[PDB]
Amino acid sequence: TTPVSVNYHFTRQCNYKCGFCFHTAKTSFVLPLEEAKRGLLLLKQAGLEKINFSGGEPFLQDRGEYLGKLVRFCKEELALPSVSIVSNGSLIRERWFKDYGEYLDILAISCDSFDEQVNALIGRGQGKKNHVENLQKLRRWCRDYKVAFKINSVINRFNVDEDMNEHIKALSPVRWKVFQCLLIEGENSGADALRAAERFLISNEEFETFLERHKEVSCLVPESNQKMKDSYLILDEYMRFLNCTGGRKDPSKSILDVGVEEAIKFSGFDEKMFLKRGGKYVWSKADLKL
Numbered sequence: 128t129t130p131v132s133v134n135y136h137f138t139r140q141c142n143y144k145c146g147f148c149f150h151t152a153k154t155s156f157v158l159p160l161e162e163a164k165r166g167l168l169l170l171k172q173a174g175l176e177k178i179n180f181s182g183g184e185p186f187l188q189d190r191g192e193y194l195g196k197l198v199r200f201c202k203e204e205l206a207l208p209s210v211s212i213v214s215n216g217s218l219i220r221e222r223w224f225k226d227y228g229e230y231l232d233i234l235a236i237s238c239d240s241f242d243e244q245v246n247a248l249i250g251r252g253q254g255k256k257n258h259v260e261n262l263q264k265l266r267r268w269c270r271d272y273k274v275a276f277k278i279n280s281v282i283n284r285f286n287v288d289e290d291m292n293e294h295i296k297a298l299s300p301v302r303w304k305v306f307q308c309l310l311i312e313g314e315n316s317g318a319d320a321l322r323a324a325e326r327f328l329i330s331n332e333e334f335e336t337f338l339e340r341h342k343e344v345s346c347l348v349p350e351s352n353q354k355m356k357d358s359y360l361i362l363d364e365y366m367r368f369l370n371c372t373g374g375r376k377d378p379s380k381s382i383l384d385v386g387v388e389e390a391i392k393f394s395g396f397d398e399k400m401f402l403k404r405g406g407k408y409v410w411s412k413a414d415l416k417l
């Protein structure tokens with residue numbers, strides 16, 4: 128397995144409380160910046176092309192400077208073709224675009240609804256911000272600072288009937304990921320879990336109904352449970368690969384300890400599904416037309 132596109136969930140801290148969250152606040156561990164950089168260098172030497180920073184909420188650590196420093200390191204020192212972030216968007220300041228936006232290819236913001244009552248039912252924030260305007264503000268900063276803009280949506284019991292066509296098109300993203308809500312034992316299912324996602328789940332038939340309602344959106348990339356569950360390379364906050372084939376998130380040894388080749392043998396990665404879901408795409412902003 129070559130680690131072509133890898134997600135690094137460097138923190139499990141978060142400031143939201145989405146009821147379905149499948150990457151919960153189980154620890155407060157974050158690698159020292161120098162150790163994270165060492166692990167990223169190991170990934171580059173093993174063939175990394177795209178890194179996505181995630182969590183947790185990645186902008187939390189050191190008030191966004193930890194993430195910015197890693198973004199700049201990957202782009203300028205490792206020369207990675209693609210550096211992306213998935214974020215809930217609650218803590219992103221324009222000063223961060225000024226300091227680090229040059230080095231970021233893609234900013235994904237998670238947006239599950241354009242209805243305030245639904246976001247309250249989900250747990251996305253506390254309703255203090257105008258969340259539609261906040262999203263538009265982040266989008267226009269991506270325009271100003273030449274970052275490609277992406278949206279991620281989790282389709283669940285409370286938004287499965289929503290029509291998002293005009294809202295998504297008003298944001299003109301390069302990529303709109305539409306995930307079926309996914310159950311993960313030890314995260315949002317079972318006795319050992321901080322969340323209980325069962326009440327959020329929808330059937331495959333309901334998820335496809337949502338997809339068909341949004342056919343007109345050209346940037347839509349759909350991922351049913353089957354397309355999502357084993358189609359990612361996921362590094363946790365210790366830089367261990369998480370294996371999701373067992374319906375849990377079982378960890379390998381750290382790449383910092385045993386190296387990439389040994390650790391990744393236990394990832395459970397299904398590369399055919401990674402390709403089938405559209406995981407490989409034009410992901411360098413210099414090669415896009417923003």
Ligand SMILES: O=c1ccn([C@@H]2O[C@H](COP(=O)(O)OP(=O)(O)OP(=O)(O)O)[C@@H](O)[C@H]2O)c(=O)[nH]1
Nearest residue numbers: 134150179181211213304355356359361371406
């Ligand atoms: O079973 C899973 C699957 C996915 N995830 C996590 O959900 C998030 C999905 O978020 P994205 O699909 O946007 O990640 P990405 O940037 O790698 O996607 P591409 O645009 O490159 O196709 C990623 O951070 C992934 O690690 C899990 O935590 N568990």
Ligand SMILES: Nc1ncnc2c1ncn2[C@@H]1O[C@H](CSCC[C@H](N)C(=O)O)[C@@H](O)[C@H]1O
Nearest residue numbers: 147148149182183184214215237279308309
């Ligand atoms: N149970 C679940 N099923 C499918 N996607 C989920 C999920 N729980 C969370 N996600 C999605 O996984 C991605 C990474 S979650 C952590 C990143 C950041 N805090 C954020 O919310 O964007 C987000 O797009 C989130 O909406």
Ligand code: SF4
Nearest residue numbers: 141143145148183215
């Ligand atoms: S899905 Fe929600 S609770 Fe989970 S890490 Fe992202 S913003 Fe936080």
Ligand SMILES: [Cl-]
Nearest residue numbers: 171172205206
């Ligand atoms: Cl190299």
Ligand SMILES: [Cl-]
Nearest residue numbers: 253254255256
């Ligand atoms: Cl809020």
Ligand SMILES: [Cl-]
Nearest residue numbers: 349350351354
């Ligand atoms: Cl799908």
